[PDB]
Each structure stands twice: as structure tokens, then as C-alpha cells.
Design a protein around this ligand. Structure first.
Ligand SMILES: CCCCCCCC/C=C\CCCCCCCC(=O)O[C@H](COC(=O)CCCCCCCCCCCCCCC)COP(=O)(O)OC[C@@H](O)CO
Ligand SMILES: CCCCCCCC/C=C\CCCCCCCC(=O)O[C@H](COC(=O)CCCCCCCCCCCCCCC)COP(=O)(O)OC[C@@H](O)CO
Ligand SMILES: CCCCCCCC/C=C\CCCCCCCC(=O)O[C@H](COC(=O)CCCCCCCCCCCCCCC)COP(=O)(O)OC[C@@H](O)CO
Ligand SMILES: CCCCCCCC/C=C\CCCCCCCC(=O)O[C@H](COC(=O)CCCCCCCCCCCCCCC)COP(=O)(O)OC[C@@H](O)CO
Ligand SMILES: CCCCCCCC/C=C\CCCCCCCC(=O)O[C@H](COC(=O)CCCCCCCCCCCCCCC)COP(=O)(O)OC[C@@H](O)CO
Ligand SMILES: CCCCCCCC/C=C\CCCCCCCC(=O)O[C@H](COC(=O)CCCCCCCCCCCCCCC)COP(=O)(O)OC[C@@H](O)CO
Ligand SMILES: CCCCCCCC/C=C\CCCCCCCC(=O)O[C@H](COC(=O)CCCCCCCCCCCCCCC)COP(=O)(O)OC[C@@H](O)CO
Ligand SMILES: CCCCCCCC/C=C\CCCCCCCC(=O)O[C@H](COC(=O)CCCCCCCCCCCCCCC)COP(=O)(O)OC[C@@H](O)CO
Ligand SMILES: [Ca+2]
Ligand SMILES: [Ca+2]
Ligand SMILES: [Ca+2]
Ligand SMILES: [Ca+2]
Lengths: 670, 670
């Protein structure tokens, strides 16, 4: 029915080898967990594991620790609400949410002994056979959440607040970003339908409107991000995040802010190492292009110019070439990226994750957009550049057949509907396939897996709970990065290639509405609950969105100019179109930034009001008079030209009288 | 020898008309000044004026007011150093500088009676005949300052700190900006000399280097500005500045930050009104262009194509056409700008001044660069476009002569050295003329004026002081906006048109070194001391510099492409050059911003440390245990599947024993 008060579960597999090592690790883990102050219970594994459950034993000590963590947060400025002086109302005015309690328990479980409770991190090399420490899903909450979200047309801020309260700030931030993106997608959908109905394809007006929308949405989301950062009390959380276990520091100096001994790595060395990203980026771009362009040319040769038998069966060759070439190449480049950022010496784990995501973004962009770039810039405008490649493929096919009769071909004429077909696939077919892969096939494979396990001693009143815990353990930990990446790639599609298919935005909106519940279902029943982390922003995805919008401002105009014919594509015209579109994008960006700066942001205003209140709180915690001072000057020659100058009229009445006499003397001449 | 303790002087002319009104105003002014608590003395005027001198009577009350002002500043966050609780060490650890004392006395003299001392502002319509309230210059300080600055090759931060301490934060900020600009000008001078010596004219490499330097200097100056804002304790001073006397507010609401009743104007209305600036900008651009282009075409007709007698005498016609056409047009457009920003409803006086400066910047840019733009983009690349204008001028000259014989002309050939001559003038001749106009002719005219006055009853020991005060009163108040504008125009010259004359940067550096003392001399002996104001930045000049650098990134490349011939200037080549230069500028801007973000800023770090200290100060002002909590659960069926689950092993020893038995049971099968 519900979790038996269990907060965290540790898998702790026990292999047949190193039994003594496993036993020593187990007893050390139990000792550490007892020292921190968490009650421990041990139960069945699957067949080699030893699942243990932890929970807070003394509620008062945990409440004190929660108050201490809140005080530390308010001291570092990540929250602007000052907690109560005594722990009697602060925990009651704002209750300890599930996410905060789980995060604090996780920090207690995994943190170095010098300042934490127990260093039970799985990547320390003294705690091996410990795959993960994960919390337990709430089945009733998941069911009610799914039902409520699927029975509502739109979600208010209360649902996102509930997501923040339960699953942490990172998942809540992703869902808020998805909701804002879906709501903002109704404008590009609306005027894309308008352009499709009224105008034709490759409309400059639609390109300008899409460029306007892509920057308006980005700036509005940045403002909403700033607002939500203080609404949930997470501001600059990266500053308070502790350093990674793997970190290379030459010396430890004094913190200029907190006045504490911290390990410092010179930023210039990190910048010098990061300068090597550009060769890596060029390498992955070239590697992915040399494969995608080759596959696309093979596909063009197979479909456009060919007359041999079995064209339909043979047409799958470049389709399957990609599904076996791009995985290996992407994996090799990912290994190179992990080698590169490992020596980049990132202190916080969040910075390391952001750098890894930024490195992966190049491959994601390459795989998601190289085919469209090739179609829009190398195929449609110039059908003659591909002639050497087509001749090479013809020669390869002829020498592969090793037969006579000079197999026939056809004249090569470009297909104006190729970009429409590609956009339609990426907008509808790829989306349906992705939805199936995201939702139905993982659940089906999990059902099959467990079924087989069951087809190939516990205690009463807990057998069902233990078995559901065992099934939950096998599920992979939910990664919010993948959903962010999918949404960012979709936004890139909108910003860059939607001018060739204005209907794409409507199907993007439909898919976003479906995904707002599909990702919820995936988190609920297809993945174990992630450890609740706190982030003040979506991270490097902001820069990804900015780059995608800027690139779309150019790509849309380039497509419009280069594909309107579907006179002979003068280069100055294309350059002028690109320049005008880019300048319009920059001017619109400046105007939107200025307008949003003029608009008040309640988050910053509330933070400033809290600062004002905490500054002002310390204040409560801490003619008859001029002559008196004038007379003391004389009592101090006696300064003939200094003291005597100001004592000539040491009174109001004498000053007034001398001024009157002065005025009449001055104007008694003329 | 020195001022007789006088802090501020009020002119208070007394005209022959409205003698009763003048007397009533004088007595009311004396009453108000007494109520605030300032001793007053009255002396000679010039012939119709009544000079009065004010000073603080009771030092203790003024010290208390200084402490209160410091507390208010620290409460609003413009300063991050918390003053001492008692006024005994705070005024001694940091002494009351002259600028701060003068500013506080001025605020006491001119401020509404509801919260201030006396509303003696000269623009209230009840205080007329009051031209200005000004402090007195220190002759010894001025002499020592001029000597020290002219006897040093470079100025350290101590000199700028002294300028801040005496003349206020605005003058100090201008001098710091000038010093930083002069120091940074040694790089463009160096590689401009390199390009001139090694390369030729119109070098793309020099254009790229200038684009790099213009953004590097801008970002470094922004960082230095942020540092100096907290070094002098002036951060967000615009937020604490009181509203202008002329302000239109529909309603008064509650301040979301300070919780005080304030007059609020909706920002959307101000944005809508500001949207009318673009028509104004286009209007002034067209008005100035239609005159400068006409004058330049007339000059070209006179010098290039002409053979009549008296060419040298007649060549001054377009030179004097500008000195009588651009003043009137600029004055009309300035009147239009003042009409526009008056209804823009700016609350703070600093915002109103910034808007006025931004409006004037369009005219300044037009006048300073239209001739160069015409020469570089309409004359050198295309000598055939000007043929209709030249024919029109020929017809005008022919019909003006009204004579026969068909006055002779010559074939029109463009002069490649025209841009070199124009740049040489703007870099050397215009600079020497500007230096003369700034320095020598105002002093000469002042000497003549006073001499004539003397050639066309006072008391002993003060006659010299009174006469020097009278001479100081006649001098115009120093305006720091003009020097800022001159420096910004010079930077625009460097960023935009220095690729046509790489030697311009060296003479710019020489002029900057000279100006660093020329402006000091102008402030010392050619202008009365301005009221010390506080600003956290140079203001709209930051946006002016950013726009000038961005425009130069394009203009330099356009000049390089369009003037290298001095094949037939293909448009795609020019567009490609502009696009590459702009993209290089944007990429370099991003890289410099990232690098400077990585670099630590001591000002922000110190502000954050102060915030940390003031947050932490409130902290000091405000196995045997797990079993005890576990046993209380039983004392609370009795929860068969919840309470009994965690009580199975309520101890370390039993947990260890059951875990051992569990491991052996699990691995006793295989
Ligand atoms: C040419 C310059 C234009 C400046 C645009 C200023 C826009 C300011 C931001 C407008 C805003 O925040 O409103 C949002 C929706 O806006 C909107 O639907 C407007 C989006 C317009 C994009 C498509 C048309 C949400 O509520
Ligand atoms: C070809 C790809 C070139 C990639 C160059 C690096 C792009 C790195 C990047 O993310 O730039 C974003 C937008 O910049 C841009 O508008 C692009 C301007 C640079 C032009 C790239 C050439 C950052 O945006 P911001 O941090 O300012 O928010
Ligand atoms: C986003 C960035 C946009 C890039 C546009 C790509 C094409 C730019 C080159 C356009 C060149 C052009 O328009 O002139 C053609 C000459 O070239 C030609 O004969 C044939 C040149 C083919 C250009 C193919 C290069 C595209 C590579 C990607 C006319 O004929
Ligand atoms: C609907 C559109 C509204 C924007 C147009 C208002 C233009 C006048 C207001 C802009 C202005 O005051 O000038 C400066 C430049 O600002 C700008 O970057 C101009 C942005 C608009 C770009 C021009 C269109 C302000 O400088 P800032 O206050 O940032 O210091
Ligand atoms: C291509 C990207 C380049 C990034 C440049 C990063 C520069 C970071 C800023 C460098 C800096 O702050 O140093 C200043 C002088 O710098 C300098 O003389 C360097 C100026 C270089 C401009 C002329 C060459 C003052 O000390
Ligand atoms: C032709 C003149 C067009 C004037 C358009 C308004 C320019 C207003 C302006 O000051 O833009 C500055 C730089 O913007 C720019 O880099 C120019 C980009 C807009 C391109 C103008 C076309 C602001 O810079 P930022 O506040 O970001 O610091
Ligand atoms: C900074 C912004 C840069 C602007 C460059 C101004 C010129 C741009 C137009 C360049 C046009 C071009 O290069 O082609 C010429 C054709 O035009 C022609 O015959 C004659 C066109 C004369 C162009 C004069 C307009 C300049 C106005 C300012 C070749 O022949
Ligand atoms: C000497 C030059 C050094 C800069 C090159 C370092 C490039 C790798 C470091 C830049 C990086 O980490 O990627 C993001 C984009 O940043 C950028 O806008 C890239 C700026 C450099 C532009 C590319 C050249 C950072 O995003 P942010 O940390 O701002 O969040
Ligand atoms: Ca999906
Ligand atoms: Ca998803
Ligand atoms: Ca000068
Ligand atoms: Ca000057």
C-alpha cells in the first residue's frame, strides 16, 4: 500500500568472489550508518544482493539537522527567508517537504567524515559492490499525479510546486520548462498554420516571425527561471555544492567569501584546457558529417537515379548504415569527451555534468540536423555539386555487381519535396517512434524481464513490499538530461528548419502536450525515483537554446533564399538575406531584453525586499543653537581673518538688518 | 590664501524690478537656512547681486547627520561597510571627505521640507533670482594638483582617489575612465604604427586588431567600473536618488523594496513614449546628412573640378557654411529632444540627464562622422554617383555668375588622399583647435572680461577673498558631459575610421595624455567647482561605446574592401567582408566576456564577503540514542506491518548477526 517508512535503499550486491571483502564492507557500512544515526534493516536481495533500508531514528535530531541546513542555506544566500530563531515555528510555517528531507538524508549517507556523517559514496573504491542508494517511489502519489495530469488540459503552478516538493528541484525545473515551452509553442503553431494556409513554402515573413518568437520565448523563460529560483529557494546552488571526490588542486587557500580553507584551482589553467574543445568540436563535426553525408548520397543514388530490380528492398541499406555507424562513432567521440573533461579538473559535480552535456550537444546537433542541412543547402539549391559523388556511387555499384549489360540508370533531377518529406518524418514519424521507444518498449521489456525471472524465504505482511522494492532496484535511475536534450533538439528544429514546413510547430505542440504526461509516466512506472537535487537553472541548455535560436535566425533566411525557386541564386542576395535576418534577430533581442528589464520581476523584488528587511532589522537593535556654537569659536588676534569673518553677524536679526541696509546701499546709487 | 570656512555660496541677484519680491525671497532664504542650521553671512555682489555664504554652525549636529546619511547608504546597499554603532570611530576610521561633506550640505540646502531641510532649489518658482549654489575652489589644492599631475608620466590610483575625495565621484569616474582609455590606447597605437610601417593602408589585419582592442578595452573598463563602484562606496546610486521636482505620477503606491509611499509611473507608458525616439533619430540623421553631404559636394566641386580665379578664397565657402548651418539645425533638434524627453516623464534627475545625453549622441555622431562616411563610402569607391550633384553645382555656379564665355572646368578624378587628409585633420588639426578652444580662449576671454569690468565699499582682510569669490561666481559651472562626449567621439574615430589612417591612434594617445592635464586645468582655473555628485558608472556612455565599437567592426571592414584599390567591387565580396568582421567581433566579444567572468573581480568578492559577514553576525546573536527512539515506537496489533518492520533488529549486534546469518544462508545454496 505504501512504503514502510523507508527513506533510502542500498543495493549492496554480494559477489561469490571477495566474500570476506564483501562482509567487511557490509559491517563497515552498518557501522557508518549507525554512527550517522539512521536505523538499518536488512532483507532479501534478488539472488546475490543484500538490500538494506535506512530511516531517521530520532525525529528531533533530524529536525535539528534540517534547521541547521536551512540556516546554512540562508547564510549563503540561496534562500532569502530568515528562519525562526527557535525550532518551533520555522518547521511548522514551512513544513519539511519530502524532497528536502530525502536530499538531507542522502547528504548524511554520502559525505566525507570530516564534515559529514559517512563517506558511503559508491565511487570511493572502499565502498564497492554498492551500485546505488535510491529512495522509494510512492505508488498512490504516482497514480494520483498521472490521473490529475492526464485529466487536465493545462497545468497550473501548483502541480509544478508539488513536483518540486516531492521529486526535487531539478525535475520540477524540467517540467516547468516543458510547460512554458509548450505554452509558448502555440504562437509559432498559430502563425505557421497561417503561413501554410495563406502563403506558400519558404516564407521570409514566417522566418522573421520565428526569429522573433525564438528570442521572446528564450528571454521570458530566463525571467521565469530567475523567478522560480527564488520561489523555491534555490539561488546559486552551484556555489554551495561541495567538490567532487576526484579533483586535482595544487594548493589550498582561504575562501575570499566564507573565510574557510578550500582547495583552489587556477581558472586560467582550466580556460587553457577548455581551449582544446574547439579541435574536439571540429573533429566530431567532421566525423559525423563524413558519415551522414555519405549515407544521404547513397540514399539519393538508390531512390533518385536507379532502375534495377528490388529498389524497395535495397533502399534500406543507408537507413541501416546510420543505425550502426553513428552509434559507434558517437560512442568513440563520447569516450574522447570524457577523457577531455576528466583532465579539465571540474570541482563541483554539477559543473562536470554541465561540461559533459555541452560536449555531447555537438554530437546531438550533428546527428539531429546534418541530414536537414545537407538537404536544404547542398541538394535543393545545387543539384550539380552531387554529380561526382553520384558518379562514384554508380562506379561502386557497377564494380560490386561484377556483371555485364551496363545496368541502367536515369537522369538526375532534384526532388523539391525531399525537404518536405524529411521535415514530415522528423516532425511526425520520428516523434511517434520516439514516443514508443520512450514509453511502451521499456515497460514491455521490463514486464518480459520480470516474467522470465519469475518463471526461472520471505516473511508475511512484507513480501509484496520487498518484491516491489526488488523490481524497483533493477530499474535504471531516471536521467533528466535526456528529456532536456530532446526538448532542446525539438526547439532547434523549430528555430532552424520550420520555415521549410510551417506545419511542424503544430505537431510539435501536440507532442509537447503528450510528452508532459509521457515523461511523468516514465518517471512514475519506468524509472526509480532520482535523488532530489537542487538547481537554480536548466544549466547549459540555456546556452544551447541561445545558440540554436541564433543559428536559426540565419538558417531560416538561407533556406528561404536558396529554396524559393522550388535569378540563378546570386551570392550577394543570399548574403544580404542572411545579414538582414541576423541584424533583425539582434535588434529584436535587444528590444526584448530592454522591455523585460523595464518589466518588474517579482522574484528579484522579493529578494531585494528581504535584503532591505534584514538590513533594517539591525537599526532597532543598535537660532538658539547656532549662536551657542558661534560663541565658542571666540573662546577657542585670535584668528583675525578666519574667526572674525563669521562672527560679524552671529544672529538672525543682525543678519537681516545688515542685509536690508546692504540692499538699500547697493540700490541707492542708480 | 584659503577659503574662510565657507562651504557654499548663493549668488542671489537682486534686479531693480520686483524689489519687494527680492527682499521677501532673501528673508525667506535666510529663515530657511537658519532652520536647517547653517550660519549665514552676506557681502558684496557684483553690481546687482547679494552673495551669501553658508557653513555648518554646530559640528556635532553635522556629524550626526553624516552618520545618519552613511547609515541610510549602508541600508540601501550602495555601501557594504557597516558603520560603527556609536559615532566615535566610524567618523575617525574613515574621515568625512570634502566631497561627502559638500554633498550633504548641498542636500540640506536644497531638499523638500517634508524630509529635508529647505526647498531652496532654483527651479521651484518661489526661489527666483537664485542662479546657482556653488562651493569654493581651493587655490592651493588646485596648484598642487596641477603641478603633481604635470610632473608625472603616469597617474596611480591615489590621484584618482584624491579627485574622488575632493571633487566627487562623477569627476573621479571621468578621470579614471580617461586614464584607463589613455593606458589602453598604447596597444592600438603600437600596432597601428606597425601596420603603417610594414603594411600599407586599409589593412584587414589592422581592422581585426582594432575590433579586438575595442571590445577588450570596453569589457576591461566595465570590470574596472564595477570595482571602483564598490571601492568608493557608490553602487546603484540611481536607486536612492530622489525624484525630480517636475514629475507626472498618476498614483502613489507602496515601495516593494523599502515599504514606503512613493510616486509610481507605469514603465509601459514610458516605453511607449520612448518608442518615438526612432522617428526623432531618423529625423536628425536626415537633417544633418542633407547639410553635411551638400557642403562636402560643394567643397569637392570647388577644389576638384574648377579652374576659375580666386579658388583659394572661394574654397572657404563650404567651410563657413557648416559653422552656420549645423549650429542652427543642431539647436533646433536639441529643442525637439528637450520637448521629447520632458514628456517622457523621467523620475530621477540622473535618468533625465542620461536620456538627454543619449538624444544628443545622435547629433554628435552625425556631426563627427558624416563627412568621413561620405568620403569613405560615397566618394572613394564610387566616383560616378556624385556626377548629378556635381552637374547641379556646375549649373548653379554658371547661373550665379550670369556671364558668358562658358567658365572652364576640369575632368573629375577622385583623389585617393582625401580620406588621409580628412583623417589627418580630425586627428591633429581639429585636436589642436579643440585644445585651444578648451583651454586658452576661455581663460583669455575671462581675463579680458574682468579687465574691462575693472576698467569700467569692502572691508579689510577679506577684500581679496570677496573679489575672487565674485570672479568665481561668473564662471560657468563645469559640465563633465562634454569631456565624456569628446572622449567617446575620439574612441569612435579609433574604432570606425582608424583603418584608413593607422597613425591616428598615436596622436590620439598624445592628445589623451595632454587632455588628462588640460581638463584638470580647465576644472581648476576655468570653471567653478561642481556640486559633488555620486554615480556608479559613466552612464549612457557605456552604451555609446558599445554601439561605436560594434559599428566600427563593420565600418573598418567596409572601408578596407571599398578602398583597397586606391575586381570592380563586387557586392558579394563587400557583404562577405562585413559578415566575417561582424562575426569575428561577436566571437571575440563572447570570448573576452567569458575570460573576464572567469577572472576574479575583487569588488564583487569584497561585497559578497561583507554580505557573508553581516549574515553570519546574526548567528552568535541568536547506538545508545537510536534504541531510545526505537523503543518509544512500540509504546506509542499496534501497527502490524509498519511498527513491527523496523523493530525486528533494533540494535547493532542483532543487525550484524542477522546479516551474517543472511549472507551464509544466501550463499549456502550455490
Ligand atoms: C520588434 C520588437 C518587438 C518587441 C517584443 C516585446 C515582447 C515583450 C515580452 C512579451 C511577454 O513577455 O509576454 C509573453 C507573450 O508575448 C507574446 O505573446 C508576443 C510574442 C510575439 C512573437 C510572435 C509574434 C507572455 O505573456
Ligand atoms: C558555427 C558555430 C559557431 C559557435 C561559436 C561558439 C558559440 C557558443 C555559444 O553558445 O554562443 C551562444 C550564442 O552566441 C551567439 O549568439 C553566436 C555569436 C557568435 C557567432 C558564431 C560564429 C551564447 O549566448 P550567450 O552566452 O551570449 O547568452
Ligand atoms: C547557414 C550557412 C549557409 C550556407 C549557404 C551554403 C551555400 C553558400 C554558397 C552560395 C554560392 C552562390 O550562391 O553562388 C552560386 C555559385 O556556386 C556554385 O555554382 C556551386 C557552389 C555550391 C555550394 C555548395 C556549398 C554548400 C556547403 C554547405 C551560384 O551558382
Ligand atoms: C517596443 C520596443 C521598445 C524598445 C525601443 C525603445 C528605444 C528607446 C529606449 C532605449 C534607450 O533608452 O536607449 C538606450 C539603449 O537601449 C537599447 O538597447 C535599445 C533597445 C531597442 C533597440 C532599438 C529598436 C537605453 O540603455 P539602457 O537603459 O539599457 O542603459
Ligand atoms: C581571440 C580571443 C581573444 C581573447 C582575449 C582575452 C583577453 C582577456 C582580457 C585581457 C586583460 O584584461 O588584460 C588587459 C590587457 O590585455 C591586453 O593587453 C590584450 C589586448 C589585445 C588586443 C590587441 C592585440 C589589462 O592587463
Ligand atoms: C544603424 C544603427 C542601429 C541602431 C540600433 C540601436 C542600437 C542601440 C545600442 O546602443 O546598441 C548597443 C550595441 O548593440 C549592438 O551591438 C548592435 C546590434 C543591433 C544591430 C543594429 C542594426 C547596446 O549594447 P548592449 O546594451 O548590449 O551592451
Ligand atoms: C557601413 C555600411 C556600408 C555600406 C557600403 C555602401 C555601398 C554598398 C553598396 C555596394 C554596391 C556594390 O558594391 O556594387 C556596385 C554597384 O553599385 C553601383 O554601381 C553604384 C552604387 C553606389 C552605391 C552608393 C551608396 C552608398 C550610400 C552610403 C559595383 O559597381
Ligand atoms: C582564449 C579563449 C577562451 C574561450 C574559449 C573557451 C571555449 C570553451 C569554454 C566555453 C564553455 O564552456 O561553453 C559554454 C559557452 O561559453 C561561450 O560562450 C564560449 C565563448 C568562447 C567563444 C568560442 C571561441 C560556457 O557557458 P557558460 O560558462 O557561460 O555558462
Ligand atoms: Ca518523446
Ligand atoms: Ca521526453
Ligand atoms: Ca581636447
Ligand atoms: Ca576634454
Amino acid at each position: 500500500e505504501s512504503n514502510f517508512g523507508v527513506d533510502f535503499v542500498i543495493h549492496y550486491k554480494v559477489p561469490a568472489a571477495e566474500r570476506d571483502e564483501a562482509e567487511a564492507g557490509f559491517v563497515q557500512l552498518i557501522r557508518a550508518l549507525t554512527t550517522v544515526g539512521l536505523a538499518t534493516e536488512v532483507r532479501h536481495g534478488e539472488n546475490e544482493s543484500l538490500l538494506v533500508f535506512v530511516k531517521v531514528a530520532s525525529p528531533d535530531l533530524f529536525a535539528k539537522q534540517v534547521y541547521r541546513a536551512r540556516l546554512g542555506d540562508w547564510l549563503h544566500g540561496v534562500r532569502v527567508s530568515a528562519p525562526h530563531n527557535d525550532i518551533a515555528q520555522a518547521l511548522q510555517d514551512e513544513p519539511v517537504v519530502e524532497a528536502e528531507r530525502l536530499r538531507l538524508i542522502y547528504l548524511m549517507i554520502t559525505k566525507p567524515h570530516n564534515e559529514g556523517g559517512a563517506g558511503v559514496t559508491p565511487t570511493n573504491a572502499k565502498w564497492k559492490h554498492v551500485e546505488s542508494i535510491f529512495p522509494l517511489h510512492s505508488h498512490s502519489f504516482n497514480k494520483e499525479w498521472i490521473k490529475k495530469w492526464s485529466s487536465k488540459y493545462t497545468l497550473e503552478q501548483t502541480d509544478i510546486d508539488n513536483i518540486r516538493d516531492k521529486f526535487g528541484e531539478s525535475v520540477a525545473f524540467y517540467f516547468a520548462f516543458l510547460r512554458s515551452y509548450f505554452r509558448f509553442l502555440v504562437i509559432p503553431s498559430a502563425f505557421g498554420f497561417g503561413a501554410w494556409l495563406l502563403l506558400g513554402q519558404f516564407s521570409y515573413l514566417y522566418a522573421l516571425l520565428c526569429g522573433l518568437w525564438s528570442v521572446v520565448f528564450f528571454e521570458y523563460w530566463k525571467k521565469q527561471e530567475v523567478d522560480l529560483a527564488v520561489q523555491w529557494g534555490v539561488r546559486g546552488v552551484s556555489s554551495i555544492q561541495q567538490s567532487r571526490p576526484e579533483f586535482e588542486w595544487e594548493h589550498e587557500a582561504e575562501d575570499p567569501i566564507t573565510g574557510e580553507p578550500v582547495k583552489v584551482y587556477p581558472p586560467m589553467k582550466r580556460v587553457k584546457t577548455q581551449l582544446l574543445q574547439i579541435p574536439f568540436a571540429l573533429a566530431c563535426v567532421v566525423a559525423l558529417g563524413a558519415l551522414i553525408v555519405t549515407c544521404n548520397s547513397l540514399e539519393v543514388f538508390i531512390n533518385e537515379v536507379y532502375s534495377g530490380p528490388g529498389k524497395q528492398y535495397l533502399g534500406f541499406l543507408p537507413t541501416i548504415f546510420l543505425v550502426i555507424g553513428t552509434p559507434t562513432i558517437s560512442g568513440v567521440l563520447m569516450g574522447a569527451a570524457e577523457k577531455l573533461n576528466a583532465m579539465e579538473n571540474y570541482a563541483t559535480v554539477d559543473a562536470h555534468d554541465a561540461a559533459l552535456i555541452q560536449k555531447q550537444f555537438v554530437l546531438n546537433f550533428m546527428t539531429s540536423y546534418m541530414a536537414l542541412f545537407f538537404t536544404a543547402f547542398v541538394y535543393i539549391p545545387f543539384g550539380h555539386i552531387l554529380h561526382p559523388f553520384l558518379n562514384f556511387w554508380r562506379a561502386t555499384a557497377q564494380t560490386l555487381t561484377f556483371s555485364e549489360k551496363e545496368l541502367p540508370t536515369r537522369e538526375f533531377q532534384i526532388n523539391p519535396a525531399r525537404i518536405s518529406n524529411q521535415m514530415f518524418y522528423f516532425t511526425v514519424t520520428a516523434q511517434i517512434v520516439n514516443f514508443a521507444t520512450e514509453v511502451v518498449v521499456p515497460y514491455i521489456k521490463q514486464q518480459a524481464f520480470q516474467k522470465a525471472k519469475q518463471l526461472k524465504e520471505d516473511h508475511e505482511e512484507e513480501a509484496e513490499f520487498l518484491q516491489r522494492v526488488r523490481e524497483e532496484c533493477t530499474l535504471e535511475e531516471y536521467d533528466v538530461s535526456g528529456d532536456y536534450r530532446e526538448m532542446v533538439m525539438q526547439f532547434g528544429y523549430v528555430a532552424m528548419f520550420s520555415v521549410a514546413w510551417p506545419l511542424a510547430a503544430c505537431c510539435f505542440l501536440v507532442n509537447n502536450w503528450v510528452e508532459l504526461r509521457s515523461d511523468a509516466l516514465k518517471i512514475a512506472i519506468s524509472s526509480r525515483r532520482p535523488i532530489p537535487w537542487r538547481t537554480d537553472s536548466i544549466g547549459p541548455w540555456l546556452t544551447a537554446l541561445s545558440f540554436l535560436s541564433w543559428l536559426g535566425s540565419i538558417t531560416s533566411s538561407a533556406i528561404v533564399y536558396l529554396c524559393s525557386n522550388s535569378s540563378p541564386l546570386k551570392a550577394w542576395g543570399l548574403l544580404l538575406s542572411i545579414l538582414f535576418a541576423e541584424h533583425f534577430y539582434l535588434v529584436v533581442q535587444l528590444a526584448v531584453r530592454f522591455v523585460l528589464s523595464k518589466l518588474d520581476s517579482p522574484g528579484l523584488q522579493k529578494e531585494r525586499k528581504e535584503r532591505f528587511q534584514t538590513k533594517k532589522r539591525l537599526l532597532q537593535e543598535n537660532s538658539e543653537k547656532i549662536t551657542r556654537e558661534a560663541l565658542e569659536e571666540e573662546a577657542r588676534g585670535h584668528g583675525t581673518p578666519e574667526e572674525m569673518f563669521w562672527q560679524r553677524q552671529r544672529g538672525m536679526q543682525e543678519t537681516i538688518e545688515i542685509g536690508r541696509r546692504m540692499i538699500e546701499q547697493q540700490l541707492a546709487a542708480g
